[PDB]
Amino acid sequence: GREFGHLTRMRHVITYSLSPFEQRAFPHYFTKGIPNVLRRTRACILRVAPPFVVFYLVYTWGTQEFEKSKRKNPAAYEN
Amino acid sequence: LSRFLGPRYRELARNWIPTASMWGAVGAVGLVWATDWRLILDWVPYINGKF
Amino acid sequence: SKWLEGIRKWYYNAAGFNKLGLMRDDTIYEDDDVKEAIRRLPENLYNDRVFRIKRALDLTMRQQILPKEQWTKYEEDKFYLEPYLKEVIRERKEREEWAKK
Amino acid sequence: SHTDIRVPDFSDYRRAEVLDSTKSSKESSDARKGFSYLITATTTVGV
Amino acid sequence: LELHAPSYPWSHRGLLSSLDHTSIRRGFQVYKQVCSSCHSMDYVAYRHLVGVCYTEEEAKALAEEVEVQDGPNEDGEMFMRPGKLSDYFPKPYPNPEAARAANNGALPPDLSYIVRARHGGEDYVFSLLTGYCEPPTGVSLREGLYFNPYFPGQAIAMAPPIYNEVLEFDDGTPATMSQVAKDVCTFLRWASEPEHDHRKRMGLKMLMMMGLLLPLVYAMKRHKWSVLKSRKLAYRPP
Amino acid sequence: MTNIRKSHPLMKIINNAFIDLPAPSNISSWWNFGSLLGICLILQILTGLFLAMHYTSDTTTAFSSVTHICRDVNYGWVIRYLHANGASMFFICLFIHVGRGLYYGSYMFLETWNIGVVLLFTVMATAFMGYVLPWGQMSFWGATVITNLLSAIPYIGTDLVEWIWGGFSVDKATLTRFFAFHFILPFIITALAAVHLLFLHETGSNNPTGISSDMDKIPFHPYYTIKDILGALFMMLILLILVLFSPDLLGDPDNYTPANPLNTPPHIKPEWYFLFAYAILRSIPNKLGGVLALVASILILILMPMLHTSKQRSMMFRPLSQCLFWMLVADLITLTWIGGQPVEHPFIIIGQLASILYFLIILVLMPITSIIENNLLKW
Amino acid sequence: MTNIRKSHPLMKIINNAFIDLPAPSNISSWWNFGSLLGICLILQILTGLFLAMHYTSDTTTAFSSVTHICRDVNYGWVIRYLHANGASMFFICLFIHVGRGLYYGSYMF
Amino acid sequence: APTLTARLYSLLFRRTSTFALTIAVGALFFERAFDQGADAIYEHINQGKLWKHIKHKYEN
Amino acid sequence: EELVDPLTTVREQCEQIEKCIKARERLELCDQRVSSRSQTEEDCTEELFDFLHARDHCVAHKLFNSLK
Numbered sequence A: 001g002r003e004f005g006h007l008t009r010m011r012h013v014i015t016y017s018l019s020p021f022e023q024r025a026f027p028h029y030f031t032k033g034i035p036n037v038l039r040r041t042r043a044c045i046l047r048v049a050p051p052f053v054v055f056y057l058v059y060t061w062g063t064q065e066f067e068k069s070k071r072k073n074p075a076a077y078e079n
Numbered sequence B: 001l002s003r004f005l006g007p008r009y010r011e012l013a014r015n016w017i018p019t020a021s022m023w024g025a026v027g028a029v030g031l032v033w034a035t036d037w038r039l040i041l042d043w044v045p046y047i048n049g050k051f
Numbered sequence C: 001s002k003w004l005e006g007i008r009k010w011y012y013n014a015a016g017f018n019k020l021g022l023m024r025d026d027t028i029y030e031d032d033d034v035k036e037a038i039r040r041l042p043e044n045l046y047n048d049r050v051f052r053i054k055r056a057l058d059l060t061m062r063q064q065i066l067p068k069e070q071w072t073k074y075e076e077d078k079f080y081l082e083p084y085l086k087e088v089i090r091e092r093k094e095r096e097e098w099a100k101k
Numbered sequence D: 001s002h003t004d005i006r007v008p009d010f011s012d013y014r015r016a017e018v019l020d021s022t023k024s025s026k027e028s029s030d031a032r033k034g035f036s037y038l039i040t041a042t043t044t045v046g047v
Numbered sequence E: 001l002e003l004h005a006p007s008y009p010w011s012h013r014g015l016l017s018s019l020d021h022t023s024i025r026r027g028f029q030v031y032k033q034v035c036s037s038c039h040s041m042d043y044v045a046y047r048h049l050v051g052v053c054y055t056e057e058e059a060k061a062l063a064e065e066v067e068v069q070d071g072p073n074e075d076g077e078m079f080m081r082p083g084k085l086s087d088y089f090p091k092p093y094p095n096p097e098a099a100r101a102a103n104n105g106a107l108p109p110d111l112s113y114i115v116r117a118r119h120g121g122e123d124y125v126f127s128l129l130t131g132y133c134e135p136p137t138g139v140s141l142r143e144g145l146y147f148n149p150y151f152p153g154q155a156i157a158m159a160p161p162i163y164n165e166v167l168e169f170d171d172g173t174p175a176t177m178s179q180v181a182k183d184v185c186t187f188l189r190w191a192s193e194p195e196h197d198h199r200k201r202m203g204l205k206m207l208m209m210m211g212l213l214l215p216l217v218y219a220m221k222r223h224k225w226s227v228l229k230s231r232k233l234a235y236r237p238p
Numbered sequence F: 001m002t003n004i005r006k007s008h009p010l011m012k013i014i015n016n017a018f019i020d021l022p023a024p025s026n027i028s029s030w031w032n033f034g035s036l037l038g039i040c041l042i043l044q045i046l047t048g049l050f051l052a053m054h055y056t057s058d059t060t061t062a063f064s065s066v067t068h069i070c071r072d073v074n075y076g077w078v079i080r081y082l083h084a085n086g087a088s089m090f091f092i093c094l095f096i097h098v099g100r101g102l103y104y105g106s107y108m109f110l111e112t113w114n115i116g117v118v119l120l121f122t123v124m125a126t127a128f129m130g131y132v133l134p135w136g137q138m139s140f141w142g143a144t145v146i147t148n149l150l151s152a153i154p155y156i157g158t159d160l161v162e163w164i165w166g167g168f169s170v171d172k173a174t175l176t177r178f179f180a181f182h183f184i185l186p187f188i189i190t191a192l193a194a195v196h197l198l199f200l201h202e203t204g205s206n207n208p209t210g211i212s213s214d215m216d217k218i219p220f221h222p223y224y225t226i227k228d229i230l231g232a233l234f235m236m237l238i239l240l241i242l243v244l245f246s247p248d249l250l251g252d253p254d255n256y257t258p259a260n261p262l263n264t265p266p267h268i269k270p271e272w273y274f275l276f277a278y279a280i281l282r283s284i285p286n287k288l289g290g291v292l293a294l295v296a297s298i299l300i301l302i303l304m305p306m307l308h309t310s311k312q313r314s315m316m317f318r319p320l321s322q323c324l325f326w327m328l329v330a331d332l333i334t335l336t337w338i339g340g341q342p343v344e345h346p347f348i349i350i351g352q353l354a355s356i357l358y359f360l361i362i363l364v365l366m367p368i369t370s371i372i373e374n375n376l377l378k379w
Numbered sequence G: 001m002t003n004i005r006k007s008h009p010l011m012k013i014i015n016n017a018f019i020d021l022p023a024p025s026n027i028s029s030w031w032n033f034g035s036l037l038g039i040c041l042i043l044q045i046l047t048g049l050f051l052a053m054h055y056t057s058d059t060t061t062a063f064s065s066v067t068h069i070c071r072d073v074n075y076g077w078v079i080r081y082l083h084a085n086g087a088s089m090f091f092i093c094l095f096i097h098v099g100r101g102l103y104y105g106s107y108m109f
Numbered sequence H: 001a002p003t004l005t006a007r008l009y010s011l012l013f014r015r016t017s018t019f020a021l022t023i024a025v026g027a028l029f030f031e032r033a034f035d036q037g038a039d040a041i042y043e044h045i046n047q048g049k050l051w052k053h054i055k056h057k058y059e060n
Numbered sequence I: 001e002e003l004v005d006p007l008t009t010v011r012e013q014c015e016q017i018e019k020c021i022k023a024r025e026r027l028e029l030c031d032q033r034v035s036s037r038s039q040t041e042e043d044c045t046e047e048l049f050d051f052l053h054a055r056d057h058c059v060a061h062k063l064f065n066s067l068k
């Protein structure tokens, strides 16, 4: 079936690599990760957050409305 | 599924409608027999002797 | 139409495949028609597509992006696969229409 | 022409000892291998 | 409408905090001298006190202090025995119908899992025991019912069980209502979770081990993946 | 000579499945959960087995046997709460896996997706019966309500319900049935998972880009074995946090009282991983309509591959589709929250709107938005 | 086109196992027992499962539960004795299978 | 002048059998030391609350 | 000497607090309302609950220091 011998036809692509023992496992981990993490967060925040913000607003409103509904209504005891 | 909206498929259906109907009857008779429906088995002349 | 052109450009920028150096036809889902169209592509176009896809996969592996000036420009994006796919789909439609009769 | 291709610089990934191009790798092969295998051995001990 | 119990600063609410076994001993004294008359703890035996708040000889003395019905003898009729640490805490009533008859149709719940069976746990139990209050204007309680704002429905059939000097602690601690309530709630928390201290210790050990391992396995993964993450690919068409 | 790993039959299967399997190099951490699921399954068996060595499925001894496990058995509490929280972790990973499949268009693997839907149903049934096993108040009454749902089926509902119950209501017969079925089902789940991996390996795995990755494939072993080990370690960290610091966080206290057929608990709700479906069930006033909506809530995954109208597979390049997906996720969270909450004034209307929005997003909004994106990309 | 039986993965496995498996033309009835064993196994799994729907594993309720299966459960005695004698049939077939393996040199596998 | 890690690799980590023996001995000693240290930390946090801290007042 | 428990002291300490005081005065108003009528159905459970909530919150924050 699908085996490394025959998956696709590729030509004129050169890949240079390094031994794991010749390179650092965490090269520029913070100084490059933090800007990259910020970039990814900026890209994805406008797509992910708004639905959860709406959910939180709905949750707070529903909890407040339920708590108000459980509260006593003075107008029922005017007489 | 407009691929199947053709005259040939209309002819193809008519050729297989009697067969599908026959298999449906087998399923109907099988279900009544297996479950002992007795809503239908009461009508059956000899089977209605049971219950 | 100018507003349509503007919103199309905005969506092209929003769809971040250009940020990976890819072209529009690289992102197409490889169904049977797309597979046939790829198999009909001339050798140079096929090799360019394969390298672009491999580079995009390498970029996504490291969660990185291509430099700002290397992103595929919307106005210079070439729909290389579109004619071949159109022909393949036309042929499939013809075969299905014949089968309908 | 297969001769105008040059391996791109990996210096921004190379460990500190093997950074110098005029210094042999066999000098510090044991150190680097021992560091990585010490990480592996401590991991295996914890596991 | 219902009232939720406050979050009291229990000495075991800490992330790695254990129970006060002195409080457990005092709470057991409270249990055997106050609520044992009507409440039961079926799933707690005297042997469970050996390593918690009483030594083995003290646990044996506690067990021998209460008679327990034993199996049939040679004649075939049940008899009574001084009791042993293999026995569980005695049932105040034989069957739940007897308990309901003796408590105006209300069944005193079993206290083995009470802190684990009620929302709020020991907070709810402490607020209930010390929360008895005179019913507000407009509340009419049936005969044999008492107003406790924390009990659902605010009409509980349990008369206030604890008060000042209800029992005299062996430890000598002043027997204020709050002290008795705190000690009995700590004991009930122990009863619900007899593995509390061991669970906390294992949690500390596993936190240390995970803090040791996760960076190490992460470093191993980075070491393996460095080949791909440094990989430079070039395209050289003719 | 030859290589044993490549020639021996069992070694051939194992090598082609987990060692030399060509795997895409760009698959993110969202691809770990699959393996995580397997781990959970294995755990749910091992732990489960060591619970069956002491549990007795009798109404007079089930609760007492559970207390014996959590009171007397050496490290019995560890095993019991590992099981209880591992079920929740299993469903967390299941939900995340289905979300990954929806987001990255993994449902285009039709056979794999269908076997996954079957696995989801089987796991839900197993968890339901396992939760019935302790025979607490929550177990008994949740079983009562869920099984009584089947009575809404027309003309066979009562007979089917009484056949499953083994009597006139939930009783000792039902408890023993559920113990046997809960014991046996996870092995059927393992067989279905083997078939699932068989179907998946027929075409390989997908990737975040949604583009075929045959040009960039890596051996599964050296990279993804260690990556999945790290993922399993993180999952084990979360599970052990839940089992050693908040063992009763995801449970309900009312399940620590022995089952009382004559006294309902203050609130009757199922486990959290069912709440969303429960919420949908409560949106429809009609019983039969509610049951049909509950079934369709899971059967919609079957329709998902056919609803795909976009020219691109993954949502990685479809921002509007991403917004719809996150709206759907927030909607599912809303349904879970409401299923937790009682049936009162705001919760009823919010739940009805949430169910309507769920079905609308999955059925109507997503295909239309994909077509709009296709028109925006000029194809 | 292709053949679904010879192409579909599960169908491929089943076809190569029990449908198009090349088998010797002269294997006697002693080669039936193998399949019989499988049958027995499946039976023991089914029957036993239906015994697990009524059996409780407590010493105070084990013998009583077995008698409940034998007296009260509908056709419970059928299932119970099917299990009990199917274990014996399983072992008869197992012994005959091992004897067949010894006699015909099947242990060379 | 080989470093500490170079000495470790040359002596223990180079051969897989010696690697495994080092792992086993380290596992034994690490289990002992880690258990002792974790118990010390836990007992210090809960000082005066555990039974072992109050058992003396009741032992005979 | 009568073994005064800290609970009374702490409850009194809250009862002189803005939340405790305002809840108590609203409870007094509700009590007057209910008592004044003859067959009214309203109850002071809600306002009592507000007062007890505030007071017991303060007591939870204060009490355990005094307990041994």
Ligand code: HEC
Pocket (backbone or CB within 6 Å): E034, E035, E037, E038, E039, E103, E106, E107, E108, E109, E111, E114, E118, E125, E128, E129, E151, E152, E155, E156, E157, E158, E159, E161, E162, E184
């Ligand atoms: C006067 C006999 C009696 C005494 C003594 C007693 N209880 Fe109870 N208890 C009852 C009864 C009766 C109920 C249930 C009343 C009801 O449900 O209306 C109850 C209920 C409870 C509840 C709450 C149950 C629930 O459903 O909310 C707790 C907690 C409790 N008991 C614990 C204790 C503790 C702790 C003590 C010792 C301070 C104690 N009991 C002493 C009779 C007693």
Ligand code: HEM
Pocket (backbone or CB within 6 Å): F041, F044, F045, F046, F047, F048, F049, F051, F052, F055, F066, F069, F080, F083, F084, F087, F090, F123, F126, F127, F129, F130, F131, F132, F133, F134, F182, F183, F186, F189
């Ligand atoms: C996917 C697999 C499984 C899932 C999702 C699952 C789920 C559950 C759940 C949620 C409970 C409730 C526990 C509680 O609330 O206390 C439970 C109980 C139980 N399960 Fe399972 N389980 C699985 C596999 C197994 C297996 C394989 C066995 C036996 C071989 C088993 C035996 C038991 C037993 C004996 C109990 C009752 C003991 C107890 O409740 O503590 N489970 N299961």
Ligand code: HEM
Pocket (backbone or CB within 6 Å): F030, F031, F032, F033, F034, F035, F037, F038, F041, F094, F097, F098, F101, F104, F106, F107, F109, F112, F113, F115, F116, F117, F119, F120, F123, F189, F193, F196, F200, F204, F205, F206, F207, F301
């Ligand atoms: C017990 C339940 C399950 C187990 C043991 C399981 C196991 C796995 C494993 C090990 C993988 C490979 C790792 C990966 O690709 O992430 C996988 C992939 C996959 N699973 Fe599951 N899975 C389960 C449930 C499901 C469900 C509920 C669905 C869908 C509703 C599903 C659909 C898929 C799909 C489509 C893939 C391929 C993903 C891709 O290639 O992008 N599975 N499964």
Ligand code: HEM
Pocket (backbone or CB within 6 Å): F184, G041, G044, G045, G046, G047, G048, G049, G050, G051, G052, G055, G066, G069, G080, G083, G084, G087, G090
């Ligand atoms: C190769 C498979 C099996 C064999 C050889 C086997 C054999 C036996 C035997 C000899 C007995 C004693 C019956 C008696 O003395 O009356 C028994 C009882 C029992 N078995 Fe099986 N069994 C098998 C599979 C299973 C399975 C898969 C289950 C459950 C899923 C199961 C559940 C039971 C139960 C509950 C009993 C006790 C009920 C009774 O004794 O009547 N067994 N089994």
